[PDB]
């Protein structure tokens, strides 16, 4: 209750990203604001060591599930709003198919009055030509869906999703994903029943922009739990 | 400057290392008291396991928070410098052993000091005390010396830290370092004098990823 009055206006986000893929090491920062009641976002990230290592469609997913709409009728299933402003850990294993893996760990949390994503990622068994270290994928995104279940054990969720990435060739990269979310605070919090997050998001560049950087809008809304 | 630090200040700090081309990342925060000289900081490895002890990033990872006495304001250069910031440039060479070369800027950034550094580790042996992970959890005391450097609007810095080896014996970890304004402002160039510093390592017991729990008192001494 006290989470989700956090949202329900706009609110400043932050997201930060530390990164080592193949020995590579970079850094992201990105900046923006959250509309959680209609489950829009504007973010824009900027590479803060010089050019990527790594596509920035494969970083989509890494760099705030709390600002998915839930609906009046699933409000009681929305885990994310319900650990702020504590916040929450976000743990994900993302296998890129016949490439390397991505291991990441966020932490999901207010600073203040903005909403912090902070995350640490770790790639590992990357192909040198491959299509994430050889750059071969598209600058766009596909729509999808995030199946979450209850992980009661855990006080937390956990979720399972297939991303689809256009590579340049015409073909499609497929990246696994799974994903586990715990409380970072001791309070209780909200423990859903099986549902799904359908996404959507627009990737574009900023005109006046020099260093490589992400402009990206995203619409998330819950769903997979019947209406009455 | 000095005026900035009459409170408890927030502390970030960020480096970003290279050792024998095994890169890594650590972020830090917390807060001092420069009133106080106390420093409380919990640093993390933002790339998984370091590739060196925490014991030899200690120096590397704001001596701007250094209690100055009274009677020793003046010679006071890293609050002076302040909110601008200064440059710290390192060569930390270890006996018988490789390199860190460093370079920082130490700045406000709104209400926060910030410390960013580039770390380069150079010609370490595979299985010395550094890349064999030979040295003990812990820190010594030590003497800072510092000395004007009027040409570069600054100051110098010279020190030995003692690193406890599994052995018992003692790794010597010679420290050179320079400090020059970023910006235009008048700043203060101190006497000969120096620093004494003391640290405890401890960690947190609920914290899983690599980290280092940092508790320093710095003060200002070598002049009557
Ligand atoms: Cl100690
Ligand atoms: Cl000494
Ligand atoms: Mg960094």
Redesign the interface.
């Known amino acids: 209750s006290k989470g989700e009055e956090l949202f329900t206006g706009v609110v400043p986000i932050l997201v930060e990203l ?1 990164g ?1 893929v193949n ?3 970079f ?1 992201v920062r990105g900046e923006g604001e959250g509309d959680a009641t209609n489950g829009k976002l504007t973010l824009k990230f900027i590479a803060t ?1 010089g050019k990527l290592p790594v596509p920035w469609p494969t970083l989509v997913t890494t760099l705030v599930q709390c600002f998915s709409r839930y609906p009046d009728h699933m409000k009681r299933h929305d885990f994310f709003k319900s650990a702020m402003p504590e916040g929450y850990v976000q743990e994900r294993t993302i296998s890129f198919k016949d490439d390397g893996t991505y291991k990441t ?1 966020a932490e999901v949390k207010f600073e203040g009055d903005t909403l912090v994503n902070r995350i ?1 990622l ?1 790639g590992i068994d990357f192909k040198e030509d491959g299509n994430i270290l050889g750059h071969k994928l598209e600058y766009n995104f596909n729509s999808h869906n995030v199946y979450i279940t209850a992980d009661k054990q855990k006080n937390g969720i956990k979720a399972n999703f297939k991303i689809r990435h256009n590579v340049e060739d015409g073909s499609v990269q497929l990246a696994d994903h799974y994903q586990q979310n715990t409380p970072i605070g001791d309070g209780p919090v909200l423990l859903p029943d099986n549902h799904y997050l359908s996404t959507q998001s627009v990737l574009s560049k900023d005109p006046n922009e020099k260093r490589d950087h992400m402009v990206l809008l995203e619409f998330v809304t819950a769903a997979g739990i019947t209406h009455h």
């Open positions: 530390d080592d020995g590579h090491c850094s060591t760990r640490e770790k």
